[PDB]
Amino acid sequence: PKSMQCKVILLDGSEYTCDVEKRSRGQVLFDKVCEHLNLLEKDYFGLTYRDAENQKNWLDPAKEIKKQVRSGAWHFSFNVKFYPPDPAQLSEDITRYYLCLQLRDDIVSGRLPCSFVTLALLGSYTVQSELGDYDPDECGSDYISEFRFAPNHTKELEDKVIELHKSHRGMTPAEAEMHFLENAKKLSMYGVDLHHAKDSEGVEIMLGVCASGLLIYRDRLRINRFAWPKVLKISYKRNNFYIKIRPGEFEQFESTIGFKLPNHRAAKRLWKVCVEHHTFFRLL
Numbered sequence: 260p261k262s263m264q265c266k267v268i269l270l271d272g273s274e275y276t277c278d279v280e281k282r283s284r285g286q287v288l289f290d291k292v293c294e295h296l297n298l299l300e301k302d303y304f305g306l307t308y309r310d311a312e313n314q315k316n317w318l319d320p321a322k323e324i325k326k327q328v329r330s331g332a333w334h335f336s337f338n339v340k341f342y343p344p345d346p347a348q349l350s351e352d353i354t355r356y357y358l359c360l361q362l363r364d365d366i367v368s369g370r371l372p373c374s375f376v377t378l379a380l381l382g383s384y385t386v387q388s389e390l391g392d393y394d395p396d397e398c399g400s401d402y403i404s405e406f407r408f409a410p411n412h413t414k415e416l417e418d419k420v421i422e423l424h425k426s427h428r429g430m431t432p433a434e435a436e437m438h439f440l441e442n443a444k445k446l447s448m449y450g451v452d453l454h455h456a457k458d459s460e461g462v463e464i465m466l467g468v469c470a471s472g473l474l475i476y477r478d479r480l481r482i483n484r485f486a487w488p489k490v491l492k493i494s495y496k497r498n499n500f501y502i503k504i505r506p507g508e509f510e511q512f513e514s515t516i517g518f519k520l521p522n523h524r525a526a527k528r529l530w531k532v533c534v535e536h537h538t539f540f541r542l543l
């Protein structure tokens with residue numbers, strides 16, 4: 260029984276290595292990584308790989324790993340797939356922990372834009388969670404944390420992290436992680452998966468996929484939103500993505516909105532993440 264070596268980048272930046280039978284479904288590898296992480300609330304997470312075009316794809320747990328990675332290396336990342344709008348209601352602290360680690364990467368990467376004050380406040384909770392109570396002995400007037408807090412670090416930002424860290428004396432790691440999440444969950448790009456696209460007129464837009472629905476970013480004043488309940492049918496054909504928008508009261512017909520994606524693979528990927536978000540965040 261032939262086994263393939265799998266390498267998974269964990270959210271703390273370390274590498275987990277295991278073996279699975281070469282005909283294994285994605286669920287097999289996912290279960291091994293989740294057991295390694297002592298993670299029970301597995302439903303919010305998944306594994307990503309890079310396709311032949313270097314695009315991030317979700318590893319489908321129902322399908323063979325080899326028929327997804329195809330010609331590519333068996334290298335993956337462990338990531339949050341469904342960002343909970345209500346992190347307080349997750350049953351375990353360790354779930355909230357992995358969600359914080361993902362969000363810290365969302366912030367440092369620039370995928371999750373954040374004001375100066377929120378960067379400093381999120382930083383201060385991470386520092387409290389990881390070092391515990393503020394200690395002056397560690398930090399002088401010229402202190403710069405090992406912690407990456409932001410896409411661009413400034414001395415002013417480091418100073419504000421410390422000032423807020425001082426206010427958190429006695430806060431437990433679980434408590435600081437919950438505060439991190441209560442702030443992060445409010446950011447306008449929290450849990451928004453962005454896809455480049457063109458509207459039916461050729462104008463360049465972003466489509467955002469998240470808990471509350473499909474978002475269409477056209478300009479800083481032209482932002483459309485389709486709550487999942489208002490979405491009957493999601494389809495793709497060639498380079499095109501389509502959503503069937505439910506008839507308004509007393510309207511005779513559904514409305515159809517069409518987008519142009521860069522290529523057929525980009526259209527399919529957007530369709531799949533939409534269907535998965537629609538299913539997941541249909542109901543409670």
Ligand SMILES: CNS(=O)(=O)Cc1cc(C)on1
Pocket residue numbers: 342343344345346347348349539543
């Ligand atoms: C605490 N989790 S949440 O995403 O905020 C709500 C939710 C969705 C599903 C499924 O289970 N719970």
